[PDB]
Design an enzyme around this catalytic site. Sequence first.
Site, PDB file in Angstrom:
ATOM      1  N   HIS B  44      12.425  80.496  35.902  1.00 58.37           N
ATOM      2  CA  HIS B  44      13.337  81.443  36.546  1.00 58.37           C
ATOM      3  C   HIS B  44      14.764  80.869  36.619  1.00 58.37           C
ATOM      4  O   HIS B  44      14.977  79.661  36.631  1.00 58.37           O
ATOM      5  CB  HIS B  44      12.945  81.836  37.983  1.00 58.37           C
ATOM      6  CG  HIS B  44      11.470  81.843  38.218  1.00 58.37           C
ATOM      7  ND1 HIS B  44      10.794  80.779  38.806  1.00 58.37           N
ATOM      8  CD2 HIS B  44      10.535  82.767  37.854  1.00 58.37           C
ATOM      9  CE1 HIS B  44       9.514  81.071  38.830  1.00 58.37           C
ATOM     10  NE2 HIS B  44       9.336  82.276  38.267  1.00 58.37           N
ATOM     11  N   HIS B  46      17.419  80.288  39.288  1.00 59.94           N
ATOM     12  CA  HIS B  46      17.594  80.112  40.733  1.00 59.94           C
ATOM     13  C   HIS B  46      19.075  80.229  41.073  1.00 59.94           C
ATOM     14  O   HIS B  46      19.956  80.101  40.239  1.00 59.94           O
ATOM     15  CB  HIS B  46      17.008  78.777  41.155  1.00 59.94           C
ATOM     16  CG  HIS B  46      15.512  78.747  41.154  1.00 59.94           C
ATOM     17  ND1 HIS B  46      14.762  78.439  42.273  1.00 59.94           N
ATOM     18  CD2 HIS B  46      14.626  78.999  40.152  1.00 59.94           C
ATOM     19  CE1 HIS B  46      13.478  78.507  41.893  1.00 59.94           C
ATOM     20  NE2 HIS B  46      13.361  78.850  40.629  1.00 59.94           N
ATOM     21  N   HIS B  69       9.898  89.653  44.029  1.00 57.86           N
ATOM     22  CA  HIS B  69       9.527  88.902  42.839  1.00 57.86           C
ATOM     23  C   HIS B  69       8.595  89.770  41.981  1.00 57.86           C
ATOM     24  O   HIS B  69       7.658  90.365  42.484  1.00 57.86           O
ATOM     25  CB  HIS B  69       8.827  87.623  43.235  1.00 57.86           C
ATOM     26  CG  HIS B  69       8.508  86.790  42.026  1.00 57.86           C
ATOM     27  ND1 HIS B  69       9.431  86.060  41.323  1.00 57.86           N
ATOM     28  CD2 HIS B  69       7.323  86.705  41.388  1.00 57.86           C
ATOM     29  CE1 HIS B  69       8.803  85.504  40.293  1.00 57.86           C
ATOM     30  NE2 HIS B  69       7.518  85.875  40.308  1.00 57.86           N
ATOM     31  N   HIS B  78      13.308  90.093  40.755  1.00 59.16           N
ATOM     32  CA  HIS B  78      14.552  89.373  40.919  1.00 59.16           C
ATOM     33  C   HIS B  78      15.314  89.331  39.587  1.00 59.16           C
ATOM     34  O   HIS B  78      14.694  89.224  38.528  1.00 59.16           O
ATOM     35  CB  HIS B  78      14.253  87.945  41.311  1.00 59.16           C
ATOM     36  CG  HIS B  78      13.457  87.782  42.550  1.00 59.16           C
ATOM     37  ND1 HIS B  78      12.529  86.804  42.770  1.00 59.16           N
ATOM     38  CD2 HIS B  78      13.535  88.482  43.710  1.00 59.16           C
ATOM     39  CE1 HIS B  78      12.085  86.946  44.023  1.00 59.16           C
ATOM     40  NE2 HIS B  78      12.681  87.979  44.623  1.00 59.16           N
TER      41      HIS B  78
HETATM   42 CU   LIG Z   1      11.676  79.217  39.739  1.00 50.29          CU
HETATM   43 ZN   LIG Z   2      11.430  85.782  41.450  1.00 48.06          ZN
END
Ligand SMILES: [Cu+]
Ligand SMILES: [Zn+2]
Lengths: 151, 151
Positions: B44, B46, B69, B78
């Site tokens: 992901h 961040h 999420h 997200h």
């Molecule tokens: Cu992550």
């Molecule tokens: Zn997420």
Amino acid sequence: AIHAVCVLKGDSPVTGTIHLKEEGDMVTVTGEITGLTPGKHGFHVHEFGDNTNGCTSAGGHFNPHGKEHGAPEDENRHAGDLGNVVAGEDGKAVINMKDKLVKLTGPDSVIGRTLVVHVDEDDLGRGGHEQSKITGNAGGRLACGVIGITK
Amino acid sequence: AIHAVCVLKGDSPVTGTIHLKEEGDMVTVTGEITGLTPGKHGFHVHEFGDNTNGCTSAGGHFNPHGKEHGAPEDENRHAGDLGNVVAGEDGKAVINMKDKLVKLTGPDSVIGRTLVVHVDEDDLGRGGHEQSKITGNAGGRLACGVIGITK
Ligand SMILES: [Cu+]
Ligand SMILES: [Zn+2]
Ligand SMILES: [Cu+]
Ligand SMILES: [Zn+2]
């Protein structure tokens, strides 16, 4: 106000954390760098936030306005030209400066670019060496980090 | 077209280089991550490009639109949700994806934010664990890097 941070690491024992924030209409740059030989070391924003080849892949000084290398106080300076940090006898330098050409928003934002601290002093363009008006003749790169967004 | 790069490192033997570029109206994400246990690992964007406390200071998933999420294919995800990378038996994962919510310009730019690869699989919000709709229950952080501007 935008806040950014940069963690310095490279092919040396030199480490440090630099914080950047918008304050009034300038950017305030603060932090400590350790592990340095006593004296002046060049310190600049370089163009690329690219650590694929150590500090070398950061490229040259950030120069969106096509100027020569200079002192922070000059008009004819790269946007990334922050002069020298001064390490004490204990090898530690502390930064506390305000700069009008460093930006954390807009076309000349340094988010995602690199800070570099150098082996040698930055001659501010005035040393009379071939690289003076390019890099300040500041020599090799002790440590660097990508400038990232923080809270 | 904007180009970015991210070099992954953390408290593990996991390393890798990720390249991001604008291509058409999406962002293309490519690269290899090595040193992983075979199988799926969460991956992901961040929020913070902050390496002052290892990968922990990167904060949570980048979520400018205030969603839960999810999977990359979902609307309720997200912005930073890139799903899983799949490591082969040799511990190496290769990425080649196109994403419409990852941006390298504008208010939702990921320049100066962080990529993280995780200890565990991302359950895509569907695992039925307390953290599923927060993190995908992907566990700890093997490696991370700040997303920087490259040539
Ligand atoms: Cu992550
Ligand atoms: Zn997420
Ligand atoms: Cu420099
Ligand atoms: Zn310069």
